Design a binder for this molecule. Structure first.
Ligand code: LSY
Ligand code: LSY
Lengths: 95, 95
């Protein structure tokens, strides 16, 4: 149905419509990243990154695994992955 | 730069992160549509559609032309067009 798929799409976009969460998703769009790598690449403060990761997890958009003492995040919803890949390609392209 | 392109991307997503505006964009993603066609397809109330179209116009995402007494809207930002096409394809696909 058009309504329920429009609400799921709208909800993904609400999760992505935040500069910090979008940047996390863009970094994960190129492959799995440790938390250390994400924080190295992001200028966001650690407490903010932590909430943002939790929100992306709640929304079903990221998952994570432990390897030793490292936490690796990755994209988990393939619809969101493709949307973010399009955003990343389109908005990182110069004119 | 990563910051200014991340803000433009984030702003597109904020404009898209609304069920009514997203549905308009999804309909325009398949080609130019008259206002009459858009309102026939949308269940949204006319005053709401009017504000939503105005917002999409302000954001640079849609443009329009007049042919006789008909107003035709179309997508105007190609980055947004591709993002919406990915949303439409991904979220209209069944499992
Ligand atoms: C648009 N966006 C979030 C993005 O990251 N684009 N990529 C770059 O801007 N560089 C310099 C790699
Ligand atoms: C055509 N049809 C029944 C359909 O669901 N298309 N998908 C969408 O329109 N969205 C907004 C996900």
């Amino acid at each position: 149905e058009m309504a329920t798929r429009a609400r799921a799409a709208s909800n993904l976009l609400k999760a992505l419509a935040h500069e910090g969460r979008l940047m996390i998703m863009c970094y994960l769009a190129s492959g799995e990243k440790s938390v250390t790598e994400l924080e190295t690449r992001l200028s966001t403060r650690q407490a903010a990154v932590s909430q943002q990761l939790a929100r992306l997890r709640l929304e079903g958009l990221v998952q994570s695994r432990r390897e030793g003492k490292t936490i690796y995040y990755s994209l988990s919803d393939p619809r969101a992955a493709r949307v973010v890949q399009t955003v990343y390609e389109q908005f990182c392209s110069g004119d």
